[PDB]
Amino acid sequence: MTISNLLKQRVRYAPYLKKVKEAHELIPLFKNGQYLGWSGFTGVGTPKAVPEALIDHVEKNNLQGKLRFNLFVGASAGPEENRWAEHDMIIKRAPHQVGKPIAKAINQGRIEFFDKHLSMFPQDLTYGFYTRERKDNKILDYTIIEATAIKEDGSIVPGPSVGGSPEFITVSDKVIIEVNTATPSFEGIHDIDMPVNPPFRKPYPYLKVDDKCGVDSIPVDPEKVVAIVESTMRDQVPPNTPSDDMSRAIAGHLVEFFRNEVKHGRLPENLLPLQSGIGNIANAVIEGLAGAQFKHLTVWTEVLQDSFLDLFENGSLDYATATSVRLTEKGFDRAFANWENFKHRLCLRSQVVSNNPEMIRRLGVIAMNTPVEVDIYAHANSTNVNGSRMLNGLGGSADFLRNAKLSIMHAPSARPTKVDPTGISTIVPMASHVDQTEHDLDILVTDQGLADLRGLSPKERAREIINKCAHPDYQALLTDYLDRAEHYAKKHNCLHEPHMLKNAFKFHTNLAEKGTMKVDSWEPVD
Amino acid sequence: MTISNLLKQRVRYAPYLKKVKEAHELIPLFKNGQYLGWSGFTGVGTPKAVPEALIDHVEKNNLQGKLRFNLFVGASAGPEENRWAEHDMIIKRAPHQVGKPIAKAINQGRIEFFDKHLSMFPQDLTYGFYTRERKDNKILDYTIIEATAIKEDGSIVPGPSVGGSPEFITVSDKVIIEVNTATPSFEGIHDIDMPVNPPFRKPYPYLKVDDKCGVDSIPVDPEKVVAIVESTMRDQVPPNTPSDDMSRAIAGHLVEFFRNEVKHGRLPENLLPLQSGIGNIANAVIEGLAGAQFKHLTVWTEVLQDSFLDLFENGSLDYATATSVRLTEKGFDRAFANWENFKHRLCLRSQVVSNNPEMIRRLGVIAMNTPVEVDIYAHANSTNVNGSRMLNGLGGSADFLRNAKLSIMHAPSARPTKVDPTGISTIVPMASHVDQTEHDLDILVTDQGLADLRGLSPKERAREIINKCAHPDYQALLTDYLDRAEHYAKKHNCLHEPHMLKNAFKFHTNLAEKGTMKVDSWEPVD
């Protein structure tokens, strides 16, 4: 606690230097059953010192399952959140997660998990919708925010992520700040909108992706802050996965579709704001757009990667707006070697603003997200495997697909199992879990083709999806199911969206019993 | 032929008097396969003269099924649309309907129907999404709009409904105007927002329910208008249905919930803008709020009834915003006997503005919709019976429920069949069709109780719904299903949202085969 000169340089508020404490000194503040808030998004910008001290305290005193907290984070946290689920330190989690231990604990009943739209989770938290049973007029007992610098008025300058930090600071009884001295200051990128509750809300004055407010810090009450912890740990982001030829085919289909749209005037020659994120398909789509001679692109998304940095360097992309930027150490070197140019080409916003239906619908964003499965009537599954197993959470996909001008979903046509190389079909008679309904989807893309579902009736949607996106091994099965359902509905005068509820989930049951969705025969229907 | 003096009084644009034509004179303009746009909403304000002329022409020349149009209307049309479906004059319909012949034709495959969010249908129509196969650079061949008066610049002053009339006028090749001289002029209560497409969109400057723009007419190109038809036929609105004791119990539960919310400060003493429309339950809820001593209420909905007029008279309600006003002839007399006091407390907007996620989320609207069925995991069905039979269309329920501060769904706990007085259960193991997901719904209300689903995991949601909203005849069945699914999921480590896909739709299959959802036993699961 020899207040390192780096720490003195980062924090410019004199009273805050009297609230400096080590991570292990904050242990008595935390008690069982408390509601905790974390800054961060998709694993970047999350606090590390205080969670590590808490884990060490739990290990030392053998408090596994006896010292647990209701953890609220803006999005998925880093490996620190995994180690809480491994030690049973979480009672409830919301609204997103990426860890494997977290998913295993949730699916084993050890953790209660509910996922929610990323634009509405902090907003509904500010309404007190999630802390109803509290009787002491509080919402969050503590918020733990990672900062890179502190302004002269005591405000907090976030790191590579904003997330729900403004709302968390708003509705927290006490605030704990980690000043990360191992990463250079991110001052100047953030455009932070402090939440205002109705009926006192005003329109967002943003007309473009680069319109700002001038507020690059989170105003926090200096009396609320109880501790300033110096953090020297850098974010751990896995290296990106190179795109494979299933992703390149998807990207080529999407690029041809975009050229056709621009040719007909339905999109401008510079396209519209895009929201592309993490995944092999997203990188492949970005590369295909880069190689398609598209210029002056704009991005209004949740997360950026190293992929968009190449666009910045080669000039295909003009400006980018995201809740968080998620890039590796070589990305750190590339960006900070060109800090001045990087600053003027990226703006970091809160997840309530980035995923807001207002901005997405006003800007005409083009949405591209990956489903677990899409049935023949364009209802998409994003969270549950076979309707029960949580994978990651809904995230911002639901916010972006309903509001976007173009709602595009890209997925592999089929996935392998232990018995059949094409044992799982992305196109099914009926999705076991519906997250994005048929009223949100516009374009469905697989490695087999592109289905244009705009202005189509359910039977037309089914025929188009089976023809274009369905794998050749499942086209016959899906066509037979649709024909039988159409005959049955003609018998029973329900031919709008024909179905056989007796046979609807037979792919999933057949996968469970035999290891492959390829059904030998359907059960007869009267 | 002579032009009516009343028509002279209503139309104030001199050139338009040279385009006055009888309804039967516009027959040659209409051809098979054309895209037609109609003004109107929920059956009020729709054109009548031209559709009746078309029906008479089809009857005279026996053109049933040979003269058909792609009909696009803002919402459900009146009885005129029923006679069109009865003669097979519709190829495609969107995005909402209420007629019984229309649903019969759609479910028999005679009409292709796709439903869409009411805030997005005119927008996506202006983008050319639904006229993708046209090669002549058009969108709508004709827009048929009913008017009550015409301003001095040739603009249209709508009637009791706005709907998608601005967008339809924007994207129409030619415009046909019916000046309804049988109804008094509705001038002054309209707030028309002319559509602007990205990237040229600006925020809506509305902060309150009564914030206006000053544009009370729809601007049209005077050269686009080809005919002015005099209409003397009034809207045929059915009398309202008195509330019954299942709806009064629902209203009492909702009133107690609102009192509790105001007591805890989660709602202001004057509440927030409400979204209540047609139906016995909506009238019951309005009456319950009136008798609950709530004052200075505000309404931001789609449709008003004659019920809200009582609130206007007794002072419980201050201002109301809706796309259309749908009230009976006695209501017409009551409102226009006090036209000055009724003009100053109602504003009619376009359905793109009324159902916009931006305004709904900014104003903190309280949404109240009626689902067909809700499963134990809060996925609500609003359109399809048993997953196939179209009832009415999604409408604006999806727009309000996701964006509203409070998302409330109220439905009867059970419905009778020919064999069992409680043969249909609104609470089912799994919904055969998902329109509103678990990420949108907050409150579920039946005549048995109120389920508060804010911040609950799927198993907690299931327990709460079965305890509060499930009918006593189905509580045992739902509890047994949930327990078996929980055991099965514990066996295979999918305990987040446990399900038995083999038994998920057994309620509906048992209803089909035996006439009641009360299943004797479940199929075993390994």
From Swiss-Prot, chains A, B:
Domain of life of the native organism: Eukaryota
Post-translational modification: Glycosylated; contains mannose.
Binding residue positions for CoA: G277, I278, G279, N280, I281, N392, G396
GO CC annotations on file: cytosol; mitochondrion
EC number, UniProt record: 3.1.2.1
Reaction catalyzed: acetyl-CoA + H2O = acetate + CoA + H(+)
Cross-referenced InterPro entries: AcetylCoA_hyd_C (IPR026888), AcetylCoA_hyd_C_sf (IPR038460), ActCoA_hydro (IPR046433), ActCoA_hydro_N (IPR003702), NagB/RpiA_transferase-like (IPR037171)
Disulfide bridges in this chain: none
GO molecular function, one term: acetyl-CoA hydrolase activity
Matches recorded under Pfam families: AcetylCoA_hyd_C (PF13336), AcetylCoA_hydro (PF02550)
Residues recorded with modification Phosphoserine: S350
Modified residues (N-acetylthreonine): T2
Catalytic residue positions: E302
GO biological process: acetate metabolic process
Compartmental location: Cytoplasm
Sorted UniProt keywords: Acetylation, Cytoplasm, Glycoprotein, Hydrolase, Phosphoprotein
PANTHER family xrefs: ACETYL-COA HYDROLASE (PTHR43609:SF1)
Further comment: Present with 4890 molecules/cell in log phase SD medium.
Recorded family membership: Belongs to the acetyl-CoA hydrolase/transferase family.
Subunit structure: Monomer.
Role according to the record: Presumably involved in regulating the intracellular acetyl-CoA pool for fatty acid and cholesterol synthesis and fatty acid oxidation. It may be involved in overall regulation of acetylation during melatonin synthesis.
Name of the protein: Acetyl-CoA hydrolase
